[PDB]
Design a protein around this nucleic acid. Structure first.
Lengths: 114, 53, 154, 65
RNA sequence: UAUUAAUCUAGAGUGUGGUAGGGAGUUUUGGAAUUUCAUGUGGAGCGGUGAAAUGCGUAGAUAUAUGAAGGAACACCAGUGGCGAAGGCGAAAACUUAGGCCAUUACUGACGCUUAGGCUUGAAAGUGUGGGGAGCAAAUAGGAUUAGAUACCCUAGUAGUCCACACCGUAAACGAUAGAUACUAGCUGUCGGGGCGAUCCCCUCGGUAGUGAAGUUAACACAUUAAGUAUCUCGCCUGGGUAGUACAUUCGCAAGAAUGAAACUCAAACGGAAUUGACGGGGACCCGCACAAGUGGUGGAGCAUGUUGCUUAAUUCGAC
C-alpha cells in the first residue's frame, strides 16, 4: 500500500517464495512457485520464479506501490529473476539490498543434502 | 549489500560482493568440523596464492 | 567425434522452379522412383489451384514456412532424470523436417485417390489448419520451458 | 602491498587513525586481504583487531550488509 | 675420566638494553541472528531430495518488521603468519603472567645433558552432578528407493553439542621424523627483532618455507627446519593370521586407558614404493549411423531358411 514497499524473495532448496509487504511489517499480498503447481525440479527453474514474482509485482503496482524496495535473499536460479520481474512491472529499482544474515554456527543445521 | 540509484550498472557492481557475502554466509549454514573446512579453505587460498605468485 | 558434415539436396522441378517441390517428390517417392511421385505432386498442385482458387506455389511455400521448425534436442541426465538442451539446428534439417511433415500428413487419409488428400493437406498446412502448425507453435512455447533446463549445467 | 608502518603510527587505536583502518573497510563488514593490501603480520593485527573493535564499539557495521 | 684441590667462560644459562605471539587464563560486552511470545497483514500453500513423499500451514500461513526474552558460536582480517610443551590459539575489548626474537670477553664458574621410575598436563566422545537447551543430529521412529534403510533423502528427534566439577587422560596428539647440543652449496619468499635511512633498498639473526648440491632413505624423496652430520639420555622393533587375544594387576561408581602370552595354523603381509596399463562407480585427448539428427522395417501378420528344444527309426554333426 505504501508508495515504496518491499517484496522479499526467499529461495529454499525447492521453491521460490515472493511475499510483498509494507515497510511497517505488514504483508498485503503473496505468491510462490508452488502456487501455479510446479513441484520439485520444475519449481526451481528460473521461469517458475519469474512468473511467481511477476504476480506480486503487478498487484503491488496497482494496489499502491509505484516502486518497491528490492530485497534480495538467498542464492539460486530464481534469486534475481524476481528483481527483473519487479522492474518490468513498473517497480523501478530504487535500490538493492542483500540483507542475507551471516550466522556463526548459532544452531546445528540437520543432515546436509547429498 | 546495497548498491543504489542504478538499475543495471550499480547492480552489476553489486552482484559480485552480493554473491561473495552470500557464499560466505552459506558455508556457515551447515554444521561441520574444523578439519575439512580449514583444509579446503586453505587449499583454495594456496591455489590463489600460487596463481598470484 | 564426427565433425560438421555438409548436407546435400537435388535440383528444382520446373512445375515451381523451387527445391521444395523436388524434395517433396523425393520424400513421397514410392517404388524408390520419382516419376510416380512427380505425377502425384503435379496432380496435387492442380487440385490445390482448383480448390479455393489460389496459386499453388505461394500456398506450398506458405505451408513449408509455417510448418517451419526451429529446434533439436541434446539429452542429458543428472542422476535419474533426463532433460534437454535446445540446440540450434542447421536450416537444412529445418526445411527437411518441414517437408517431411508435409509429406507424412499429406497421405493420412483413406477415402479417394491420394491426389485430393495431398492437395487438401497442403492447403490446410498453408491455411494453418492444425496438422503440423501446432508442432511449430508447441516448439515455440516449449522454447520458454526447456531453456530453463538448458541454463543449469548438471 | 604494505600499508601500515608507512602511513600509520605503529600504535593503532580507533581514534586519530580510523581512516587508514577504514581503507581496508566498507560499510559491509569485510577487511581487504593480503591479495589487495599485503600488509605484514603486525599490520594485519592492527587492521583486524582495530576494525572489528570499531565494529565492536558501534562505529562501523559489525556484520550489517 | 669416576674422585679431589682451585680458577676461566663458552655449554645451563643469567644480566642489561631493545623486544614481538589469535599464548593461556581471568573479566566484560556487541552483533549476524537461531528459537519463542505479542503487535499485525496475508488468504492456500510452506517444506525436503537424484526423484518425490514424510513433515509443517486455515487457534491465520508463506513471509514480513518492531519489541521482549533464553541458549549457541563469533562474517572479513587469517597470511610459502607468529606463538603456545603437544593438546591448540581468530567478534572485539582490558588485566595477571608462562614463554619469545635481537646483541652483549658482560656473572656463578660446568653450576650441564637427557631420561627408565617419578611430577604435572592432556582434543574429544560419553558419565553423573545444577541451569537454561537456540538449534540439531547416536540411538529411535515414517515416507521413499532398494534385493532391504536405524546407510546415502528428509521430517520428528534424545544423549550430546553449552557451561561449572571431577573421571573418561585416548586421537590421523603422526612430521607415523624424541629431548638437550654443535656443524652442512645455494637460491627464491615471509614474519619478528637489532641498525640505518621519504618509504624503501640493504645488512644481522632467528622463526617460518620450498627446489636442489652434498649427504641420506631399496624406492617414493628429505635436504640448512633432513630422513645430512655427529655426542649424552631415553622409548619403540623380528614373519602373517591367532593378536593386544587370554590372564594378572591396576586409575575413574560412571565412558574408557596401559596390559600381554599361547594353543592351532600359513611363507608373507587386502605389505611398501621407482614400471606399465583399463576402469573410474575421480577424471582427460583424438577418430568412429557408435548415438542423436533422422530414414524406413522388423519383434506384432504371413513366409523360407537358420537355430534352441522335443521326438522317433534320423530329425547328422561343429558354430551359440
Amino acid at each position: 500500500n505504501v508508495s515504496s514497499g518491499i517484496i522479499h524473495v526467499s529461495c529454499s532448496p525447492n521453491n521460490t517464495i515472493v511475499s510483498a509487504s509494507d515497510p511497517g511489517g505488514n504483508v498485503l499480498c503473496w505468491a510462490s512457485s508452488g502456487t501455479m503447481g510446479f513441484k520439485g525440479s520444475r519449481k526451481k527453474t528460473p521461469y517458475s520464479a519469474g512468473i511467481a514474482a511477476d504476480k506480486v509485482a503487478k498487484t503491488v503496482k496497482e494496489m499502491g506501490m509505484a516502486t518497491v524496495k528490492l530485497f534480495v535473499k538467498g542464492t539460486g536460479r530464481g534469486k534475481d529473476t524476481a528483481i527483473r520481474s519487479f522492474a518490468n512491472a513498473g517497480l523501478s529499482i530504487t535500490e538493492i539490498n542483500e540483507k542475507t544474515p551471516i550466522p556463526h554456527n548459532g544452531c546445528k543445521p540437520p543432515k546436509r543434502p547429498r | 549489500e546495497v548498491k543504489n540509484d542504478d538499475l543495471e550498472l550499480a547492480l552489476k557492481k553489486f552482484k559480485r560482493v552480493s554473491l561473495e557475502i552470500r557464499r560466505l554466509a552459506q558455508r556457515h549454514e551447515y554444521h561441520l568440523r574444523k578439519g575439512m573446512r580449514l583444509r579446503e579453505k586453505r587449499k583454495i587460498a594456496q591455489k590463489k596464492r600460487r596463481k598470484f605468485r | 567425434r564426427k565433425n560438421r558434415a555438409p548436407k546435400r539436396t537435388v535440383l528444382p522441378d520446373p512445375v515451381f522452379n523451387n527445391t521444395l517441390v523436388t524434395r517433396i517428390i523425393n520424400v513421397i517417392m514410392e517404388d524408390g522412383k520419382k516419376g510416380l511421385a512427380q505425377r502425384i505432386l503435379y496432380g496435387a498442385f492442380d487440385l490445390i489451384e482448383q480448390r479455393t482458387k489460389e496459386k499453388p506455389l505461394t500456398v506450398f511455400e506458405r505451408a513449408v514456412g509455417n510448418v517451419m521448425p526451429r529446434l533439436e534436442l541434446r539429452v542429458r541426465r543428472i542422476a535419474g532424470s533426463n532433460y534437454q538442451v535446445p540446440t540450434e539446428v542447421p536450416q537444412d534439417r529445418k526445411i527437411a523436417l518441414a517437408l517431411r511433415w508435409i509429406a507424412m500428413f499429406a497421405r493420412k487419409r483413406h477415402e479417394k485417390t491420394m491426389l485430393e488428400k495431398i492437395a487438401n493437406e497442403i492447403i490446410d498446412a498453408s491455411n494453418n489448419t492444425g496438422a503440423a502448425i501446432k508442432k511449430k507453435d508447441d516448439t515455440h512455447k516449449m522454447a520458454e520451458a526447456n531453456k530453463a533446463f538448458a541454463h543449469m549445467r548438471w | 602491498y604494505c600499508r601500515f608502518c608507512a602511513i600509520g603510527q605503529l600504535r593503532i587505536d580507533l581514534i586519530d587513525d580510523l581512516e587508514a583502518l577504514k581503507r581496508f573497510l566498507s560499510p559491509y563488514a569485510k577487511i581487504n586481504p593480503r591479495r589487495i593490501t599485503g600488509n605484514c603480520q603486525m599490520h594485519q593485527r592492527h587492521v583486524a583487531k582495530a576494525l572489528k573493535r570499531a565494529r565492536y564499539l558501534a562505529l562501523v557495521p559489525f556484520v550489517k550488509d
